[PDB]
Symmetry: T
Subunit: 135 residues, 12 copies
């Protein structure tokens, strides 16, 4: 029923691609409604903030769609917290990371994720919702 969408740094800057973070929340909320889900979308540049939201979803046994931004490639902490999730974890990148710098082609999160969606824009979020609806 409930799905957590968690955005790391600096996804607050979407727009500043026309879509803003707020537009994104709204798109996600609408699609969620359509799927009979409730989406809790949250963004933070703070690793610790993210860890806290992840722990919460671990305790509630809620699924997570997670776009960690740059922490994806760097944070073992975040990985460890996600590793505790018992519901599904979908990792999401808007851009195709494999078309950029080699360092972006590694993720500490993918191996503990259920699955990963990259390069499909903001629609990756919606497709992740839909996966979770049909599961």
């Amino acid at each position: 029923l409930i799905v957590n969408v968690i955005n790391g740094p600096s996804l607050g800057r979407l727009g500043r691609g026309g879509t803003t973070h707020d537009e994104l929340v709204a798109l996600i909320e609408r699609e969620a409604a359509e799927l009979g889900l409730k989406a809790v979308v949250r963004q933070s540049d703070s690793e610790a903030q993210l860890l806290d939201w992840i722990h919460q979803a671990a305790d509630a046994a809620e699924p997570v769609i997670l776009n960690a931004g740059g922490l994806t490639h760097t944070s073992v902490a975040l990985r460890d917290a996600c590793a505790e999730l018992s519901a599904p974890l979908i990792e999401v990148h808007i851009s195709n990371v494999h078309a950029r710098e080699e360092f972006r082609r590694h993720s500490y999160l993918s191996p503990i994720a259920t699955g990963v969606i990259v390069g499909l824009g903001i629609q990756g979020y919606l497709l992740a919702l839909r996966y979770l609806a049909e599961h």
Copy 2:
């Protein structure tokens, strides 16, 4: 309107996971119909067969959903043929490759793909369709 779904080796063996390759074709065909698309699904263990289907989609300017199996990690040829596509290319893995052997965590295809979906089972195919419908 038309979408090519291309499966490499040995996706003919799905089932032998309950879903068979034929079931998969049927699921994909149904979803495609629902999206107002036509899906041409094709499978082959032959790299050359795949290259030929890719060239065709290049000439027709049709989008491709491609699950190359093991050739994903090994074939520059396949990459080169896909690199010619002008419509979108979605790379698909049923399993989460990042949860397996390190060698599976590299793909010659991802960097030239539009995007990539891994670990969402056979539903990755359907989600890829839906991306292409809304684009």
Copy 3:
């Protein structure tokens, strides 16, 4: 006399292994009393919070027992702050990191630590206390 015990992310989640973080504080406090020490145990998922506690121990010339969780493998910042400590620094892992992923077998902290204890469970904390008592 005073010993700082510093726990990083997500050691707040011990339990959720039966021992909780609170139990851990209590075990450490009891052992410290027994050794004629005072233990100040502190936990945070915030790197910056940890850095601040480390700086404080640097200024006070107090010893530190530090379990950085995942930041152990990733944070040069933390290393740099610890590098300032003039009293002893004992690094502690509950689990044996060398029995897990290769990435966990490197630590930015070990080379500037006095010593390191891994894989002895929560008792590593108590043994670290005892080292510091007899020194």
Copy 4:
């Protein structure tokens, strides 16, 4: 006219080298005045705090002199935020990093910086100002 000087962890500890962080602010402020600039100097051990100050400078199209401390070698997030700056970005290290550990000889920031100054002490800040004044 306005120049942002951003210091990461643990540059609050300069002194504790005689020069303190406050002295540094004052030196920078004086030189800035001399150049007909205004310097906004800010320090934080929080990656997120830094990201926020960087985003701000991105939105204001102000130049940044940035000394990220240890995050220089570890944070893709920070890199990504700096990558958004449209004014110049000068990276600054007080010490010569190339004379220390090999891990310090890589920086996620240098490739997106305008330029880099290392090993010239606190005077690197002043020289960076002067670059920006004559540009």
Copy 5:
């Protein structure tokens, strides 16, 4: 009840740090007595001698505290013999190996050990005893 302490090459040279190998045996024996344990301490520069003592402890299901010296970094054989132990294995280094040459930062033994203590001097032996007493 019985604990095997096994020292490899060239721990016979402790002293030649004031503490000699004999002093070490005596310190260990005293602490063991205090814990209600019996310590069998043995040293050899011969890999084969060590393997034999390890096999013996495997057959007797006795715990081992093992300081292999340089064989720690080089001997798969020793690892394989330890891998047979069913009681606990604590690996011990007197010096902090992570503060020395990079080659010393790898150990064939750590991954099959219960845990590891480095850089706490000869007291690591005593702390290892105490772990085994409370277990």
Copy 6:
């Protein structure tokens, strides 16, 4: 009082960026005058020529600003000669090397330099002068 500016290959080709090597000499000479310094600027495509100028500055105990061009990444000889300097050595790159090929991101000179300035154009030379004036 005296400062040696040493340019390697092929900095004779500056211009052929509008600034020519001669303009550069003149800019440097003017700034030097302004600082109460004398600048001896010299350029050569010959490694041996450069080594000779470096040895001379070693014997005279004069500071060197050195832009070695491509020899920066390749010449241990040059490093060894600079290693003899007892006055300061500032390494200078006009372009930001960290924004180019990976091979340019290593320098045999940086670790023995006092400091390094890259990506600030020809102004890096002038800023290096100014460092040396205030020191």
Copy 7:
């Protein structure tokens, strides 16, 4: 009872070592008869052909002796198909690969094989038969 012997490229060229591929089939057939086995020996330069023969042996639960030639070092596909076999898989090289180029010292097949025989000439095939007879 039935054993599949599968030869990849270009084992059709044995002879062109006196033994030809046909001689090899005959030697294998004779030894098989002697062991109370039936040997189905098949050769192809086509990866896809091989995959098909492997799938067949997977479905029939027949053991495979496989000499993949150069695909041994390059084909994840082949590995994946073999990974499906439930009967034994013996990998065979006629030549000692470890005495040749470093690239030949890796095999995608060995880790999923039951065992491997290299450098014993064509007799490796016969010894593999005999293993399978006594099992």
Copy 8:
């Protein structure tokens, strides 16, 4: 007298650079005539097809000009078959591979080739002919 020109995948797509594969055959045939040679030009996306043509040239002791496309970087099989050629083998790339992705800068074929021509366009084929004519 006879020269084999062998083109791998997907050199059938030349044109789709104006020159088509057919034009290429014709250019090669004309130049061959001019040199007093006969050129047999053949193309295939099938590795196995190529291997067969290579074996044939091995048996006939005919020289080969070979442009393997992407198999150049990936196929040990192809290398092994070429290694059997007793006449000359010239490797040909139309594009300069060293100006592209790092993975293209390795070739399994070069070390067993007589020589290699890259980046000279379709004229590399003609120059290879001419080498073989004057030899």
Copy 9:
């Protein structure tokens, strides 16, 4: 006529897999008799002991079947002594090493061996005998 079977550490522990080292000697002795061979089987955890047995076989020009255990991956000495053998050397592993840790996938012995048998259990010894009988 005579064949040396040499077992390193800790193959004395076979059993402690039901087959003991003694059973193994007996199996080998019986098969040898059957082949018209005499088998001298010897085991030692001492590298030096093994070297001595290898030198002896070098001087006698007798073939060796050698299972070095862990020294296989670590000992250049052993390699060097085997390199002197003029009769055949068969390397034997009971387990499939390629299915274990990456470090076990390298052997200092394979490149100087005649051939290698891994993963066929104790029957690898018997098959090695049979190779040597038919040679």
Copy 10:
């Protein structure tokens, strides 16, 4: 019309292969005449000499055929000077470098060259001429 042929160290030693450097000049001069070109062939063991000849060809917008000998693998300087050429640059090796030491399989020049010819002997020079004539 004019083509520069530049030979590095120690191509003065051709002969001391029967062909001497002088013969080579003469062969090149004759072929050039035949093509309606003028060839300026020059050789030097001095990197700086070569750089000077390269700069000259840059200023004159003349094409270069360059055989740098060992500097090919080592000199970034030379690369940088060639990178300035606006006419074509053909890199030439007489021997097949890919059949020798691994270090020779890298070239700082290839990526900035138009194309590369290796292993065709002195005829590579003549073929390079011919390329440049038909272009």
Copy 11:
């Protein structure tokens, strides 16, 4: 006055190069006499034996000429024991190791040796003596 010459495995096999180990002892003894030295030459295939002889020379403050054979590349233990020597340590290889396998081009002993002599045959021993005589 006294010099220890220590030979590891399998230098007992010199001859079996005409010179035998005994001849070598005699050559060394004669040269030593000539230099006014006494040479104690000792050989063993046992690492532990060597360690014991090294410890002895450490305690006696005698210089060591050491040819460790294959242990040179593999033994940290031996390195550690040599690291204790306070008199000079000369490392000796008869053969030029840098002309053989890459693995032989690393030595755990060289960095703690006074110096190293390779590839001069048995005369390296005599030259090492002479160094020690004139020192």
Copy 12:
């Protein structure tokens, strides 16, 4: 009879260790006289100068003692010229390179040298002479 001693950069700076380059020439000349040799000692910071002296010794079939300084680690050219020598080549380092930076532990010259002497000071030159006298 004649021996060439060749010193690269910056061995002209010996002294500026008390021994100067001139002293070194004199020591070498005296020892040479004593051995019934003539020593031609030559020094240059110019790679090309060295190459010329090496070519000369190649043509004269004279032995070379060569201390290339930093070019030892960097110059393939120099290696190639030495590779032509038919008399012996002894490589000499005054300092123990294996006790310094890792980059100094590789030499392009060692593998083509007869032998190598490092860390014995200027006496390495004299010992190299003596080797060549007794050969």
